[PDB]
Symmetry: C2
Subunit: 245 residues, 2 copies
């Protein structure tokens, strides 16, 4: 239990990668608060997965586009569990449009969820974090490699996390808080499943020829949140099957 | 002991980070051969120390073969040799250029090729590079940074070559063992990152240059 006694907040913990992260951190001993945007049934299941196994959990409904909701969710977690040790920013919207086509509303939505709300959750969490803490953003390998059209604004919103991570590491380093950007490739989830011709085309671009598994991303995030990772900070860390080689 | 039954080779394993990597992989259950013909081991033990200078290719290829004779095909190779000589562009001696090219660049490839010829599918190759591949704030480090940035293209192309065997290839970039965190790193922190990459949770990480540098390169 390398995270015994620690308190984690996961923004976007109800499905796929975020569910695996919440379960992973609780299995290592942390108390976990998480936000979910859509399904109280789905969040109840993740919360039960944590507690059937003997872990402590708070689920919080919050729209990641709404900054006040995210600030409120961090304070409600702190009232529940005390000051945070770990923050994982896993909200995301993955949405396609060429440069000449994308709607202004879809731009403003990916900016709000994937960029703005990562900063807003990070600032409130840091206000209520212990020294020695961990902030982990979940970016994308599309910050580094964009092989196809239609991903310009998605890739912009993910490459924004590279400069945020460097700068936040410089701000929070004197408090021994690390800040890192995890850049996944394709991961088998129920809205991006390893099945179909698009998945087969992405695999051809990868060195490993298979999608990642939710649990593999959770295992990297738990390592970075743990007591052996206090020297890793400011970094953009690819876990993408070689997509960006 | 998730490395129970697995076999690792560490090039440069006798002190500091290299020792810490040997001790962490053995503590997780691995057989470990490392370089630092002469060898020492313990009866009933699974750590074998082999004397080999990292500039000498034939001694490296033999050491790998020795390790495979004792333990079977490799699962893990860690390339941790390294030489660091300071010198400005105008002054650095060519002998010192050639020492850093042989140790930091050439022998990393020679060991990787021999290990790839005797490695199980699903294996792991981990190079130990440097944060100076990304950030070189002062003079005197040009050829050292040149030798460490070489690992970035080596890692990418080796990940493409060996991916079909499910072997991952990554480049760990340490800082000192300009900082964002206000302390140097510990040998055991580098070893913990190499052990994670070398283990069964890390099969999706390949081709990457992964900084563990206290925010030196931020």
């Amino acid at each position: 239990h390398p995270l015994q006694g620690k308190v984690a907040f996961v923004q976007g913990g109800s499905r796929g990668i975020g569910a695996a992260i919440v379960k992973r951190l609780a299995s290592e001993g942390a108390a976990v608060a998480f936000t979910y945007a859509a399904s109280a049934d789905r969040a109840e299941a993740v919360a039960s997965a944590v507690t059937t196994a003997g872990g402590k959990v708070l689920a919080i409904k919050a729209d990641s586009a709404d900054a006040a909701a995210l600030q409120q969710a961090v304070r409600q977690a702190v009232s529940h569990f005390g000051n945070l040790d770990i923050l994982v920013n896993n909200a995301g919207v993955f949405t396609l449009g060429g440069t000449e086509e994308l709607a202004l509303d879809d731009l403003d939505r990916m900016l709000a969820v994937n960029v703005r709300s990562v900063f807003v959750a990070s600032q409130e969490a840091a206000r209520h974090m212990n020294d020695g803490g961990r902030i982990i953003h979940i970016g994308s390998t599309n910050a580094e490699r964009v092989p196809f059209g239609g991903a310009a604004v998605y890739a912009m919103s993910k490459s924004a996390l590279v400069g945020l991570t460097k700068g936040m590491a410089r701000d929070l380093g004197p408090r021994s808080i690390t800040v890192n950007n995890v850049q996944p490739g394709p991961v088998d989830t129920e809205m991006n499943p390893d099945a179909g011709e698009f998945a087969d085309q992405l695999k051809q671009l990868m060195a490993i020829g298979r999608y990642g598994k939710d649990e593999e991303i959770a295992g990297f995030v738990a390592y970075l949140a743990g007591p052996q990772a206090g020297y890793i900070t400011g970094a953009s860390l690819s876990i993408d099957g070689g997509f960006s080689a």
